[PDB]
Amino acid sequence: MRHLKSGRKLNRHSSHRLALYRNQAKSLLTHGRITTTVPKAKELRGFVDHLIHLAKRGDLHARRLVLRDLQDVKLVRKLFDEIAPRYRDRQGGYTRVLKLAERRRGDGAPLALVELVE
Amino acid sequence: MTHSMRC
Amino acid sequence: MNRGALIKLVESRYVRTDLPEFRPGDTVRVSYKVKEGNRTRIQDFEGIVIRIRRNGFNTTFTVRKVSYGVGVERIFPLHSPLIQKIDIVQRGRARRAKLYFIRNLSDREIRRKLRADRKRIDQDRAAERAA
Amino acid sequence: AKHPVPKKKTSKARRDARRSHHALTPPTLVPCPECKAMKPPHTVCPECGYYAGRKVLEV
Amino acid sequence: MIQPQTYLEVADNTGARKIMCIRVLKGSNAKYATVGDVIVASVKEAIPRGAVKEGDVVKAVVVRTKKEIKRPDGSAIRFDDNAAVIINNQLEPRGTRVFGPVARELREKGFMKIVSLAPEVL
Amino acid sequence: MKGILGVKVGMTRIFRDDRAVPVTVILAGPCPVVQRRTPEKDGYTAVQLGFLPQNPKRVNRPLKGHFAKAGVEPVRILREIRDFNPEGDTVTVEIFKPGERVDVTGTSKGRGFAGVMKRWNFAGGPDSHGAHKIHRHPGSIGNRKTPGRVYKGKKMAGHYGAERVTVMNLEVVDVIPEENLLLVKGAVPGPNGGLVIVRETKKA
RNA sequence: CGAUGUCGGCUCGUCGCAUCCUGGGGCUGAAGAAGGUCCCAAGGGUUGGGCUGUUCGCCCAUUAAAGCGGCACGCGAGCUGGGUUCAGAACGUCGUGAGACAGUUCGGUCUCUAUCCGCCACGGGCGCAGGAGGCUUGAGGGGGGCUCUUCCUAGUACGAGAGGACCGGAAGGGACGCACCUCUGGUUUCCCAGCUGUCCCUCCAGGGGCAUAAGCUGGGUAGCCAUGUGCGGAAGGGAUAACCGCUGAAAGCAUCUAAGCGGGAAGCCCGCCCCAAGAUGAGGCCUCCCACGGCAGCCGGUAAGGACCCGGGAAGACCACCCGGUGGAUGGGCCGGGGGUGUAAGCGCCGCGAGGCGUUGAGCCGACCGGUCCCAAUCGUCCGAGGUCU
RNA sequence: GAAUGCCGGCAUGAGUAACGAUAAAGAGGGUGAGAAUCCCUCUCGCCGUAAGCCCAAGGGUUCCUACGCAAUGGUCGUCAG
RNA sequence: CGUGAGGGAAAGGUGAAAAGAACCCCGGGAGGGGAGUGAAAUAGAGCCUGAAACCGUGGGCUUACAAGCAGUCACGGCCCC
Ligand SMILES: [Mg+2]
Ligand SMILES: [Mg+2]
Ligand SMILES: [Mg+2]
Ligand SMILES: [Mg+2]
Ligand SMILES: [Mg+2]
Ligand SMILES: [Mg+2]
Ligand SMILES: [Mg+2]
Ligand SMILES: [Mg+2]
Ligand SMILES: [Mg+2]
Ligand SMILES: [Mg+2]
Ligand SMILES: [Mg+2]
Ligand SMILES: [Mg+2]
Ligand SMILES: [Mg+2]
Ligand SMILES: [Mg+2]
Ligand SMILES: [Mg+2]
Ligand SMILES: [Mg+2]
Ligand SMILES: [Mg+2]
Ligand SMILES: [Mg+2]
Ligand SMILES: [Mg+2]
Ligand SMILES: [Mg+2]
Ligand SMILES: [Mg+2]
Ligand SMILES: [Mg+2]
Ligand SMILES: [Mg+2]
Ligand SMILES: [Mg+2]
Ligand SMILES: [Mg+2]
Ligand SMILES: [Mg+2]
Ligand SMILES: [Mg+2]
Ligand SMILES: [Mg+2]
Ligand SMILES: [Mg+2]
Ligand SMILES: [Mg+2]
Ligand SMILES: [Mg+2]
Ligand SMILES: [Mg+2]
Ligand SMILES: [Mg+2]
Ligand SMILES: [Mg+2]
Ligand SMILES: [Mg+2]
Ligand SMILES: [Mg+2]
Ligand SMILES: [Mg+2]
Ligand SMILES: [Mg+2]
Ligand SMILES: [Mg+2]
Ligand SMILES: [Mg+2]
Ligand SMILES: [Mg+2]
Ligand SMILES: [Mg+2]
Ligand SMILES: [Mg+2]
Ligand SMILES: [Mg+2]
Ligand SMILES: [Mg+2]
Ligand SMILES: [Mg+2]
Ligand SMILES: [Mg+2]
Ligand SMILES: [Mg+2]
Ligand SMILES: [Mg+2]
Ligand SMILES: [Mg+2]
Ligand SMILES: [Mg+2]
Ligand SMILES: [Mg+2]
Ligand SMILES: [Mg+2]
Ligand SMILES: [Mg+2]
Ligand SMILES: [Mg+2]
Ligand SMILES: [Mg+2]
Ligand SMILES: [Mg+2]
Ligand SMILES: [Mg+2]
Ligand SMILES: [Mg+2]
Ligand SMILES: [Mg+2]
Ligand SMILES: [Mg+2]
Ligand SMILES: [Mg+2]
Ligand SMILES: [Mg+2]
Ligand SMILES: [Mg+2]
Ligand SMILES: [Mg+2]
Ligand SMILES: [Mg+2]
Ligand SMILES: [Mg+2]
Ligand SMILES: [Mg+2]
Ligand SMILES: [Mg+2]
Ligand SMILES: [Mg+2]
Ligand SMILES: [Mg+2]
Ligand SMILES: [Mg+2]
Ligand SMILES: [Mg+2]
Ligand SMILES: [Mg+2]
Ligand SMILES: [Mg+2]
Ligand SMILES: [Mg+2]
Ligand SMILES: [Mg+2]
Ligand SMILES: [Mg+2]
Ligand SMILES: [Mg+2]
Ligand SMILES: [Mg+2]
Ligand SMILES: [Mg+2]
Ligand SMILES: [Mg+2]
Ligand SMILES: [Mg+2]
Ligand SMILES: [Mg+2]
Ligand SMILES: [Mg+2]
Ligand SMILES: [Mg+2]
Ligand SMILES: [Mg+2]
Ligand SMILES: [Mg+2]
Ligand SMILES: [Mg+2]
Ligand SMILES: [Mg+2]
Ligand SMILES: [Mg+2]
Ligand SMILES: [Mg+2]
Ligand SMILES: [Mg+2]
Ligand SMILES: [Mg+2]
Ligand SMILES: [Mg+2]
Ligand SMILES: [Mg+2]
Ligand SMILES: [Mg+2]
Ligand SMILES: [Mg+2]
Ligand SMILES: [Mg+2]
Ligand SMILES: [Mg+2]
Ligand SMILES: [Mg+2]
Ligand SMILES: [Mg+2]
Ligand SMILES: [Mg+2]
Ligand SMILES: [Mg+2]
Ligand SMILES: [Mg+2]
Ligand SMILES: [Mg+2]
Ligand SMILES: [Mg+2]
Ligand SMILES: [Mg+2]
Ligand SMILES: [Mg+2]
Ligand SMILES: [Mg+2]
Ligand SMILES: [Mg+2]
Ligand SMILES: [Mg+2]
Ligand SMILES: [Mg+2]
Ligand SMILES: [Mg+2]
Ligand SMILES: [Mg+2]
Ligand SMILES: [Mg+2]
Ligand SMILES: [Mg+2]
Ligand SMILES: [Mg+2]
Ligand SMILES: [Mg+2]
Ligand SMILES: [Mg+2]
Ligand SMILES: [Mg+2]
Ligand SMILES: [Mg+2]
Ligand SMILES: [Mg+2]
Ligand SMILES: [Mg+2]
Ligand SMILES: [Mg+2]
Ligand SMILES: [Mg+2]
Ligand SMILES: [Mg+2]
Ligand SMILES: [Mg+2]
Ligand SMILES: [Mg+2]
Ligand SMILES: [Mg+2]
Ligand SMILES: [Mg+2]
Ligand SMILES: [Mg+2]
Ligand SMILES: [Mg+2]
Ligand SMILES: [Mg+2]
Ligand SMILES: [Mg+2]
Ligand SMILES: [Mg+2]
Ligand SMILES: [Mg+2]
Ligand SMILES: [Mg+2]
Ligand SMILES: [Mg+2]
Ligand SMILES: [Mg+2]
Ligand SMILES: [Mg+2]
Ligand SMILES: [Mg+2]
Ligand SMILES: [Mg+2]
Ligand SMILES: [Mg+2]
Ligand SMILES: [Mg+2]
Ligand SMILES: [Mg+2]
Ligand SMILES: [Mg+2]
Ligand SMILES: [Mg+2]
Ligand SMILES: [Mg+2]
Ligand SMILES: [Mg+2]
Ligand SMILES: [Mg+2]
Ligand SMILES: [Mg+2]
Ligand SMILES: [Mg+2]
Ligand SMILES: [Mg+2]
Ligand SMILES: [Mg+2]
Ligand SMILES: [Mg+2]
Ligand SMILES: [Mg+2]
Ligand SMILES: [Mg+2]
Ligand SMILES: [Mg+2]
Ligand SMILES: [Mg+2]
Ligand SMILES: [Mg+2]
Ligand SMILES: [Mg+2]
Ligand SMILES: [Mg+2]
Ligand SMILES: [Mg+2]
Ligand SMILES: [Mg+2]
Ligand SMILES: [Mg+2]
Ligand SMILES: [Mg+2]
Ligand SMILES: [Mg+2]
Ligand SMILES: [Mg+2]
Ligand SMILES: [Mg+2]
Ligand SMILES: [Mg+2]
Ligand SMILES: [Mg+2]
Ligand SMILES: [Mg+2]
Ligand SMILES: [Mg+2]
Ligand SMILES: [Mg+2]
Ligand SMILES: [Mg+2]
Ligand SMILES: [Mg+2]
Ligand SMILES: [Mg+2]
Ligand SMILES: [Mg+2]
Ligand SMILES: [Mg+2]
Ligand SMILES: [Mg+2]
Ligand SMILES: [Mg+2]
Ligand SMILES: [Mg+2]
Ligand SMILES: [Mg+2]
Ligand SMILES: [Mg+2]
Ligand SMILES: [Mg+2]
Ligand SMILES: [Mg+2]
Ligand SMILES: [Mg+2]
Ligand SMILES: [Mg+2]
Ligand SMILES: [Mg+2]
Ligand SMILES: [Mg+2]
Ligand SMILES: [Mg+2]
Ligand SMILES: [Mg+2]
Ligand SMILES: [Mg+2]
Ligand SMILES: [Mg+2]
Ligand SMILES: [Mg+2]
Ligand SMILES: [Mg+2]
Ligand SMILES: [Mg+2]
Ligand SMILES: [Mg+2]
Ligand SMILES: [Mg+2]
Ligand SMILES: [Mg+2]
Ligand SMILES: [Mg+2]
Ligand SMILES: [Mg+2]
Ligand SMILES: [Mg+2]
Ligand SMILES: [Mg+2]
Ligand SMILES: [Mg+2]
Ligand SMILES: [Mg+2]
Ligand SMILES: [Mg+2]
Ligand SMILES: [Mg+2]
Ligand SMILES: [Mg+2]
Ligand SMILES: [Mg+2]
Ligand SMILES: [Mg+2]
Ligand SMILES: [Mg+2]
Ligand SMILES: [Mg+2]
Ligand SMILES: [Mg+2]
Ligand SMILES: [Mg+2]
Ligand SMILES: [Mg+2]
Ligand SMILES: [Mg+2]
Ligand SMILES: [Mg+2]
Ligand SMILES: [Mg+2]
Ligand SMILES: [Mg+2]
Ligand SMILES: [Mg+2]
Ligand SMILES: [Mg+2]
Ligand SMILES: [Mg+2]
Ligand SMILES: [Mg+2]
Ligand SMILES: [Mg+2]
Ligand SMILES: [Mg+2]
Ligand SMILES: [Mg+2]
Ligand SMILES: [Mg+2]
Ligand SMILES: [Mg+2]
Ligand SMILES: [Mg+2]
Ligand SMILES: [Mg+2]
Ligand SMILES: [Mg+2]
Ligand SMILES: [Mg+2]
Ligand SMILES: [Mg+2]
Ligand SMILES: [Mg+2]
Ligand SMILES: [Mg+2]
Ligand SMILES: [Mg+2]
Ligand SMILES: [Mg+2]
Ligand SMILES: [Mg+2]
Ligand SMILES: [Mg+2]
Ligand SMILES: [Mg+2]
Ligand SMILES: [Mg+2]
Ligand SMILES: [Mg+2]
Ligand SMILES: [Mg+2]
Ligand SMILES: [Mg+2]
Ligand SMILES: [Mg+2]
Ligand SMILES: [Mg+2]
Ligand SMILES: [Mg+2]
Ligand SMILES: [Mg+2]
Ligand SMILES: [Mg+2]
Ligand SMILES: [Mg+2]
Ligand SMILES: [Mg+2]
Ligand SMILES: [Mg+2]
Ligand SMILES: [Mg+2]
Ligand SMILES: [Mg+2]
Ligand SMILES: [Mg+2]
Ligand SMILES: [Mg+2]
Ligand SMILES: [Mg+2]
Ligand SMILES: [Mg+2]
Ligand SMILES: [Mg+2]
Ligand SMILES: [Mg+2]
Ligand SMILES: [Mg+2]
Ligand SMILES: [Mg+2]
Ligand SMILES: [Mg+2]
Ligand SMILES: [Mg+2]
Ligand SMILES: [Mg+2]
Ligand SMILES: [Mg+2]
Ligand SMILES: [Mg+2]
Ligand SMILES: [Mg+2]
Ligand SMILES: [Mg+2]
Ligand SMILES: [Mg+2]
Ligand SMILES: [Mg+2]
Ligand SMILES: [Mg+2]
Ligand SMILES: [Mg+2]
Ligand SMILES: [Mg+2]
Ligand SMILES: [Mg+2]
Ligand SMILES: [Mg+2]
Ligand SMILES: [Mg+2]
Ligand SMILES: [Mg+2]
Ligand SMILES: [Mg+2]
Ligand SMILES: [Zn+2]
């Protein structure tokens, strides 16, 4: 059973799934938009929204907390100086997921774009 | 193995 | 509907606010109403709070004492109407919320691990100074 | 286990009866309100890159 | 939760110090004894020249358990050991002292003499 | 013979006469009377009850007409209480008094496809001593060439739960008419949020 | 004999009754209690261990009882492999010997994929004269069916005493069953903290990886759970079995019977719980659409409606089912609460230092109870009646 | 018309088991008719008395570069022994 | 294939003549459609003839209350000559 369990497994063990989320996070915050599979995209929203929200708070603690996941000081500085001020008056919903029309050829995978919002 | 040894 | 509120609204008739705050590691005396044969009396149970499990009205706490050579753990509902009163005997300072590990300690091993919580002792001595 | 095995060859009738549930359903498609092309609903138009009235994707 | 094979301390001065439950005397096939239940047990360890010796098949009543027992008031009680007091076929203790606390449930089950000899009823 | 449609809220315990009493809280009323099955029209006696209001702009024309003939707003659910003819047009919790006994019908939690140990309390196999990939298996399912088959109703693996269940003769611990609350001692089928039916008991 | 695997166990049942217990009886060398024997009765029940490969049996401690047999000595394409039943080795014994022994001893390869029937679950199709959305009747199935102790009656009836009832009433158990998570007790793969070694970021401080598919350790919400909680077996009605009658001839008496009428089992029927109109014998009620256009038919556009798609769900293998789709709180975010962890970082002060103290129940923080349109359920498409014959 | 016959062809089982170590992947850019699978970059993970390096057997052009993708490669292929 | 002695296959046919299909079209290619050759192109090189199993497309009749070694005897319905 799975009654009221939150969180996809994505056929990865505990540490592989965390690193997957962290790497997707770095990639999305680097380019502003990425393509992944639809299930990965949807899971990415929550992970990245929380790091952006902490960057809205902007204190030293937030920065160090975000660095636990993102690890790259230059990227965090970008998140704190360029990304987060875009969202000071936005209460959640810092990312959007739109589904792409065409599946991957080699495995039929349905794709989606995940992007930071305006 | 082989056969069931019916002996 | 809000199902959570409806339960809290059911439990509201039974919620107590008279009892004092305490933490794991505090030495506490629970004056507890007991039935026996024909009469019902008040039997004090005094020991170290080793556990507070919280669930609003449904929170309970576990008190441990050594009686005549034997360890005894007594679990109480924090909002039970059989609890007459709870007296803080001593403030101890634990580093964790569950003190199961003291079941395995000698008496001086415990005294060394749950030293007196001078800060909250002073909070208690400062209070009671009312007028 | 003792290696179960088909007792009789399946007849042409039964093999094809089994496949009465194999036909593909055609893709669900709707016209894109911008370029009129047929595309799956709730997906970005792969022909003009529009979704929800605005342009999202270069095509 | 006592069953056959369970060892129990002896909370009296009969002479026995450790007994091993071999039967729960509560119907045809009870799985477990709690406080107030009688068991049949062999005596595994005695002190010399007490009433009961090693090898005796005795009756006892469980007075303390490590499995906590639940009460209608919504509370529970748990002891550090599993302990019983040895009785005869009249519920009466065969020794003259009871050591350590005992559960209040014994009173309702008619083991009154044990309740009085006990230094604490919890 | 009286009934009402309900909603399982959650469990708690309350304190009654220095005893802790585990309860399930049920939001019962109000249940408007939507149709009356009579011996003349339908061949039996029963009330069709309604429960929980629904978006009128969400209820199709065939159901609109049905509600109209009763003069009632759209409700999310219709259920019949059999052999019940309430005097009024709206059934509330106050058909029950504390102390009465009730039967409660809900839909059990669904275990999905369930193994023989979870569904039927089978013993499974040994976990050591040579046991070979059968630790949770059912063992034998029959005999040999006589009868050469498996009984109907044979206990085997399959979907378990998410079925209608009636627990009977529960004590009513309280009625709170200001909130349409019904407290019942003990456990009731299904999840919090699930629809349940509360009928007077059939045990004597 | 171009193979029907062979003991026992474990698992899973099911059946017979020549009945072990529980229910009903008659007779008794039946005072009572307790037994004996036979009759009716298969609904349910029929324990845990020591020994042995054992079946059986004996023993221990209980029990209402610890029944006997069938199902290929039920069940190895379900498991085991102790025994038996190859090849090694040894003892006793037999044989000059090679070797031999339902004699003993130690060891000894038990085969991933289910086509058909059958079984458990779940769908798709078409059917149920118009087509729909709901709510139902219950033919017929299935589940269940146990029992003990104490107290009252009453230390009464009975009995010299020992002892000790019927009937009727009350309380509390055991095992089993269904559901549940408030409590008790588990789990809780990253929810919090602490710790070692190493490498790294960025030197300090602070962190990250790896040490398992959690490095280790102390805890742990929701969910799933039992060891935990609630509830069930009925009651009641009917027809009976053995057995006991009332009235009553044949047969002036007698006779439960030949006419007629009573009483009477844990059993039988109904009653309780669950499925159920593919019940093709395709049922019933409430409501909605409606006579459209072209040679019981026909092909196009609709109708009431439905599906597709999408956001999801204590529903779920897929399918199904249920909720929602901007006139929206469905999921994600955010916020508040619950809950867990147990006082973050940084700074300040004390100590030579490991550390300590304060800010501070802080910081972090899955699922739980809610709020909030910030993000996403955009936009739409396709099926879908005109109702046969007296 | 049969010889568990012989040689070959094609069925069934079945869109089923499986796709060969549970060290692990993600994204951006490029190339191309076509890209999860080729090239480049960044992140992540695994070996490190080896899963690194050098000899000897054995193998015998598998080496380097250009042009290729029918087949071989357990998928794909623009890559390649 | 086997260390080796040794074992030891399968595989024939365009047409009279290459006249072996310029060129155009879809396609990366493969392949096909036209044009063209030829008495003939389901003689187009995967080439004479081209059986059978086996697979598919289209049509006639038939089938979702039914019990079967699958046929046979009879009658009726529909379709065809
Ligand atoms: Mg499961
Ligand atoms: Mg489930
Ligand atoms: Mg699981
Ligand atoms: Mg959820
Ligand atoms: Mg996670
Ligand atoms: Mg997997
Ligand atoms: Mg995997
Ligand atoms: Mg993987
Ligand atoms: Mg997979
Ligand atoms: Mg790891
Ligand atoms: Mg991508
Ligand atoms: Mg991916
Ligand atoms: Mg700063
Ligand atoms: Mg975090
Ligand atoms: Mg989309
Ligand atoms: Mg798609
Ligand atoms: Mg590909
Ligand atoms: Mg592929
Ligand atoms: Mg709740
Ligand atoms: Mg102490
Ligand atoms: Mg200290
Ligand atoms: Mg302090
Ligand atoms: Mg096998
Ligand atoms: Mg096997
Ligand atoms: Mg095997
Ligand atoms: Mg096999
Ligand atoms: Mg065959
Ligand atoms: Mg076959
Ligand atoms: Mg065949
Ligand atoms: Mg055929
Ligand atoms: Mg065919
Ligand atoms: Mg088939
Ligand atoms: Mg298939
Ligand atoms: Mg199709
Ligand atoms: Mg003692
Ligand atoms: Mg002692
Ligand atoms: Mg002695
Ligand atoms: Mg000894
Ligand atoms: Mg004693
Ligand atoms: Mg005392
Ligand atoms: Mg009350
Ligand atoms: Mg509905
Ligand atoms: Mg319901
Ligand atoms: Mg359910
Ligand atoms: Mg449940
Ligand atoms: Mg199982
Ligand atoms: Mg179960
Ligand atoms: Mg189980
Ligand atoms: Mg079950
Ligand atoms: Mg078992
Ligand atoms: Mg077992
Ligand atoms: Mg087991
Ligand atoms: Mg195992
Ligand atoms: Mg084995
Ligand atoms: Mg094996
Ligand atoms: Mg197996
Ligand atoms: Mg195993
Ligand atoms: Mg099995
Ligand atoms: Mg067989
Ligand atoms: Mg067999
Ligand atoms: Mg048969
Ligand atoms: Mg289901
Ligand atoms: Mg009751
Ligand atoms: Mg309310
Ligand atoms: Mg329910
Ligand atoms: Mg044979
Ligand atoms: Mg054969
Ligand atoms: Mg054969
Ligand atoms: Mg054979
Ligand atoms: Mg065979
Ligand atoms: Mg076993
Ligand atoms: Mg049997
Ligand atoms: Mg008989
Ligand atoms: Mg009897
Ligand atoms: Mg009897
Ligand atoms: Mg008798
Ligand atoms: Mg007598
Ligand atoms: Mg008698
Ligand atoms: Mg008799
Ligand atoms: Mg029986
Ligand atoms: Mg029986
Ligand atoms: Mg032993
Ligand atoms: Mg044994
Ligand atoms: Mg034996
Ligand atoms: Mg024997
Ligand atoms: Mg006996
Ligand atoms: Mg008896
Ligand atoms: Mg036995
Ligand atoms: Mg037998
Ligand atoms: Mg038997
Ligand atoms: Mg036989
Ligand atoms: Mg035999
Ligand atoms: Mg035998
Ligand atoms: Mg035999
Ligand atoms: Mg057998
Ligand atoms: Mg067998
Ligand atoms: Mg086997
Ligand atoms: Mg066997
Ligand atoms: Mg078999
Ligand atoms: Mg077999
Ligand atoms: Mg077989
Ligand atoms: Mg063996
Ligand atoms: Mg032997
Ligand atoms: Mg041999
Ligand atoms: Mg000799
Ligand atoms: Mg001789
Ligand atoms: Mg000799
Ligand atoms: Mg021998
Ligand atoms: Mg032999
Ligand atoms: Mg022999
Ligand atoms: Mg012999
Ligand atoms: Mg032997
Ligand atoms: Mg020997
Ligand atoms: Mg042997
Ligand atoms: Mg060995
Ligand atoms: Mg062996
Ligand atoms: Mg295998
Ligand atoms: Mg099959
Ligand atoms: Mg199998
Ligand atoms: Mg068959
Ligand atoms: Mg089959
Ligand atoms: Mg079948
Ligand atoms: Mg169907
Ligand atoms: Mg109709
Ligand atoms: Mg309908
Ligand atoms: Mg019904
Ligand atoms: Mg019926
Ligand atoms: Mg039927
Ligand atoms: Mg029945
Ligand atoms: Mg019964
Ligand atoms: Mg008396
Ligand atoms: Mg009297
Ligand atoms: Mg007496
Ligand atoms: Mg009685
Ligand atoms: Mg049963
Ligand atoms: Mg049920
Ligand atoms: Mg169950
Ligand atoms: Mg539950
Ligand atoms: Mg809970
Ligand atoms: Mg719990
Ligand atoms: Mg707990
Ligand atoms: Mg974390
Ligand atoms: Mg480290
Ligand atoms: Mg660096
Ligand atoms: Mg450092
Ligand atoms: Mg620090
Ligand atoms: Mg590393
Ligand atoms: Mg490493
Ligand atoms: Mg380890
Ligand atoms: Mg690793
Ligand atoms: Mg770690
Ligand atoms: Mg842990
Ligand atoms: Mg824990
Ligand atoms: Mg939990
Ligand atoms: Mg919990
Ligand atoms: Mg829980
Ligand atoms: Mg559960
Ligand atoms: Mg239990
Ligand atoms: Mg019970
Ligand atoms: Mg007479
Ligand atoms: Mg007469
Ligand atoms: Mg008569
Ligand atoms: Mg009669
Ligand atoms: Mg009668
Ligand atoms: Mg009964
Ligand atoms: Mg039903
Ligand atoms: Mg119908
Ligand atoms: Mg129906
Ligand atoms: Mg019909
Ligand atoms: Mg018909
Ligand atoms: Mg019929
Ligand atoms: Mg009809
Ligand atoms: Mg109908
Ligand atoms: Mg009707
Ligand atoms: Mg589904
Ligand atoms: Mg789903
Ligand atoms: Mg699904
Ligand atoms: Mg679908
Ligand atoms: Mg539906
Ligand atoms: Mg609902
Ligand atoms: Mg809908
Ligand atoms: Mg809607
Ligand atoms: Mg829409
Ligand atoms: Mg929402
Ligand atoms: Mg709502
Ligand atoms: Mg929300
Ligand atoms: Mg979700
Ligand atoms: Mg809180
Ligand atoms: Mg808290
Ligand atoms: Mg501090
Ligand atoms: Mg601090
Ligand atoms: Mg610090
Ligand atoms: Mg200093
Ligand atoms: Mg400290
Ligand atoms: Mg907090
Ligand atoms: Mg947070
Ligand atoms: Mg959160
Ligand atoms: Mg919070
Ligand atoms: Mg809850
Ligand atoms: Mg609003
Ligand atoms: Mg459209
Ligand atoms: Mg012939
Ligand atoms: Mg052959
Ligand atoms: Mg031959
Ligand atoms: Mg042949
Ligand atoms: Mg051949
Ligand atoms: Mg051959
Ligand atoms: Mg050939
Ligand atoms: Mg061949
Ligand atoms: Mg062949
Ligand atoms: Mg072939
Ligand atoms: Mg074929
Ligand atoms: Mg084939
Ligand atoms: Mg095939
Ligand atoms: Mg498939
Ligand atoms: Mg298959
Ligand atoms: Mg499969
Ligand atoms: Mg395979
Ligand atoms: Mg393989
Ligand atoms: Mg597979
Ligand atoms: Mg490995
Ligand atoms: Mg692999
Ligand atoms: Mg592994
Ligand atoms: Mg490794
Ligand atoms: Mg990435
Ligand atoms: Mg990738
Ligand atoms: Mg990549
Ligand atoms: Mg770009
Ligand atoms: Mg590729
Ligand atoms: Mg490609
Ligand atoms: Mg790429
Ligand atoms: Mg790869
Ligand atoms: Mg590359
Ligand atoms: Mg990056
Ligand atoms: Mg090294
Ligand atoms: Mg070579
Ligand atoms: Mg070459
Ligand atoms: Mg290739
Ligand atoms: Mg290729
Ligand atoms: Mg290719
Ligand atoms: Mg080529
Ligand atoms: Mg290949
Ligand atoms: Mg390939
Ligand atoms: Mg390969
Ligand atoms: Mg290329
Ligand atoms: Mg190379
Ligand atoms: Mg060779
Ligand atoms: Mg050879
Ligand atoms: Mg060679
Ligand atoms: Mg040769
Ligand atoms: Mg040749
Ligand atoms: Mg030829
Ligand atoms: Mg020629
Ligand atoms: Mg010629
Ligand atoms: Mg050209
Ligand atoms: Mg051209
Ligand atoms: Mg082209
Ligand atoms: Mg072209
Ligand atoms: Mg190319
Ligand atoms: Mg060409
Ligand atoms: Mg073409
Ligand atoms: Mg051509
Ligand atoms: Mg010509
Ligand atoms: Mg041609
Ligand atoms: Mg021709
Ligand atoms: Mg020709
Ligand atoms: Mg010729
Ligand atoms: Mg030819
Ligand atoms: Mg040909
Ligand atoms: Mg041909
Ligand atoms: Mg042909
Ligand atoms: Mg074809
Ligand atoms: Mg055809
Ligand atoms: Mg056709
Ligand atoms: Mg019929
Ligand atoms: Mg028909
Ligand atoms: Mg037929
Ligand atoms: Mg027919
Ligand atoms: Mg024939
Ligand atoms: Mg015929
Ligand atoms: Mg005829
Ligand atoms: Zn478009």
Side-chain angles (χ1 to χ4, degrees), chain C residues 28-30 43-47 63 65 72 74 76, chain E residues 122:
Chain C
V28 123
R29 185 188 303 114
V30 186
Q43 184 184 55
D44 288 351
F45 186 91
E46 180 181 348
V63 178
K65 97 186 193 179
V72 178
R74 191 94 157 84
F76 295 105
Chain E
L122 295 177

Side-chain angles (χ1 to χ4, degrees), chain D residues 11-35 37-46:
Chain D
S11 81
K12 307 179 178 105
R14 196 182 296 264
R15 171 197 68 194
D16 296 350
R18 187 170 62 237
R19 305 175 166 168
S20 76
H21 304 287
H22 289 178
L24 308 171
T25 80
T28 303
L29 299 169
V30 298
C32 161
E34 242 290 271
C35 73
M38 303 306 301
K39 49 134 239 172
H42 312 92
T43 39
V44 175
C45 182

Side-chain angles (χ1 to χ4, degrees), chain E residues 1 4-5 22-32 40 57 59 67-68 70 74 76 78:
Chain E
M1 274 182 75
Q5 296 304 108
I22 73 205
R23 190 74 188 169
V24 177
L25 279 191
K26 187 179 56 164
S28 118
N29 65 341
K31 291 176 202 300
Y32 311 118
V40 187
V57 170
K59 307 209 177 73
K67 179 58 188 174
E68 71 284 346
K70 304 184 62 198
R78 168 168 55 245

